[PDB]
Each structure stands twice: as C-alpha cells, then as structure tokens.
Amino acid sequence: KAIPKDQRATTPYMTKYERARILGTRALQISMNAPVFVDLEGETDPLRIAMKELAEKKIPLVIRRYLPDGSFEDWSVEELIVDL
Amino acid sequence: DQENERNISRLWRAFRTVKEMVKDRGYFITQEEVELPLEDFKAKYCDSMGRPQRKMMSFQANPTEESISKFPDMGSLWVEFCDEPSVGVKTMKTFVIHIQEKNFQTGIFVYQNNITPSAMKLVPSIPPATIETFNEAALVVNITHHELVPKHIRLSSDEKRELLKRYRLKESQLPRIQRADPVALYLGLKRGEVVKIIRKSETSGRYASYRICM
C-alpha cells in the first residue's frame, strides 16, 4: 500500500537485525567488486569496509519496513540513527 | 431462628449484586440504593412471619445521562425475581410479554432452582428486545470483586471501529472472550462487542488489552 515519508511511525533507530543485515548485504556487494563509497584507509576486508561505509553513513541502501497488514515504511541508512 | 435466617441472608446479597451489576452495565443507581444493610432489608420485602416476598422485589432502571453520551440508543432495563422455586413455561409468557408491550430492550430474570427447558426457548423470539437468565446462586457473590478478575469495559461501536483502525487490525486477529464467559455476562456482551481489559503489571503498572466477542 505504501506510506508517506511523513505520518511515519516506526522506530527512528536502526534495529540490530537491520544493521546486521545491512553490513552483511553491503559486504557481499563490496566483496563482489561493487563500488566502494568511502576512502579505504587501507582496509581490505569487505565487512570491515562495510563497517566503514556505515559509519560515514554512506551506504546507498533503504530498509523497507513491512507492517503486519502489508503496508510498509521506507527508511534510509542515512536517516536511521545508529546507537547499538 | 432455624435455617431460614440464612436462606434470606443469601437472597439478600444475591440482590445486592444484581444492583451493582445493573449500575456497572451503565444504569442509574445510588451507592445508597446498594449498601442497603440487612436489617432495613427484612422490613420491606417480607410479609408477616418474616419470610421473603420476591415478587415484591422486581423493579425497573434507567440509563445514567453519561451512558447516553457514548451509547445513544441504550434502551431501558427491567429486573424480575420469583417466589416460584420451580418456575415453568407458563409464568414466562407473563414476563416475555410484559416487556414486548411496555417496549424496553433489556430483560433480566432471576430463577431460583431452575427454569423449564420448554420455557427458555422463548427468549430469542421478540427482537430487537433482549433477555438474559441468571441463577440466584451465581449472583450471591459479585465475581468482579475477586482479587484476580481485573476490570473490563464495553466499547462504543465507535471506540471499536477505532481500535481496529489504529492497530490496522482485522476483526479476527483480535483476542477474544467467550459469549458465556462469566464477566461477559456481568455486562451482557453481544457477538461483536469489544471489551477493554485494563489490568495491573509487574513490568509496567497498567496494561491495556482488548477482547472481542464470539
């Protein structure tokens, strides 16, 4: 059904499952020769580069949050706060 | 004294409850018309020797102006008792009709030892009007006063259509309560009416819950 970027209702923060999966997912790509959006301070381990992209919040992904009834909310790694 | 001084003491409390219940349902009654002590009770619904005259206890009741705010069409209620330890399918036409004429909506009847299976099958024969059947022995104590049973609340067909829209719930995904469930009767629910159960919690003082009916 979708939901406006306003009227948004989820948690402003990133869930462990999310972050967990983002890094993974992102690694996977980086490990696949996808483009890396951060300067590698010399890193060479994908999941480690991923940890970097994720701290300069330079990961081009979007976490779609399905709700019990099907509608979803879309947040960007950008927005989502990362406490953990 | 003998063992009759106790068969009234029971009808008494039994009465008390009926009252309380009729007020929590959403009707008009004073706390003074309830706390009616034993003493002053005798000298009212008794005859000579000192025995109970039930046909003399029956009465009517009306909605509080508050119950009109949330429930518009909430009709009037009537309660009735009987001096007949063994009520039958004849004295029923007495009640069933008494209401179909006056035109109320809620009919509460109180049987003693029981009713005749020939009788009971005459309640769902005059809609809208609704009737309910209660045994004395089950109204001696108000079940709602028990340490465990927390308090429930009826939800307006408005308050309900909202509970769903706010949780994006379908009717069926809601926690249910029995049509026969003790408390469901104490308030007289109807297949579809939702109840809000508000209890205490060792995790967070109060927890709001809902129970639809089936």
Rounded to whole angstroms, the Cα distance separating A22 from A84 reads 14
Report resolution (Å) to 1 decimal. Answer: 16.0
B-facing residues of A in 9-68 (CB < 8 A) are: 67-68
Cross-strand bridge partners of residue A63 = A75
Chain B touched by A69 (CB under 8 Å)? yes
Experiment used for this model: cryo-EM
Rounded to whole angstroms, the Cα distance separating B23 from A63 reads 52
* Contact between residue A72 and residue A65 where contact means Cβ atoms under 8 Å apart: yes
Q: How far is A4 from chain B (nearest CA, A)?
A: 16
Domain ranges within chain B, ordered by starting residue: 1-141, 142-214
Sheet holding B106-111: strands in order across?
B59-61, B77-80, B106-111, B130-135
**Tokens linked to B6:** 């106790």
Residues of B in contact with A69 (CB under 8 A): 168-170
- From residue B140, alpha-carbon distances to A6, B5, B9, B26 in Å are 56, 15, 10, 21
Answer whether CATH 3.40.30.10 is correct for domain B142-214.
Answer: no
Q: What amino acid occupies position B141?
A: V
Fold matches, B1-141 and B142-214: no
Q: How far is A77 from chain B (nearest CA, A)?
A: 26
Residues of B in contact with A68 (CB under 8 A): 168
Buried b (16+ CB within 10 A) or exposed e, B139-168: bbebebeeeeeeebebbeeeebeeebeeee
How many C-beta atoms lie closer than 10 Å to residue A83's C-beta? Answer: 6
What is the third-level CATH fold of B1-141? Answer: 3.40.1340
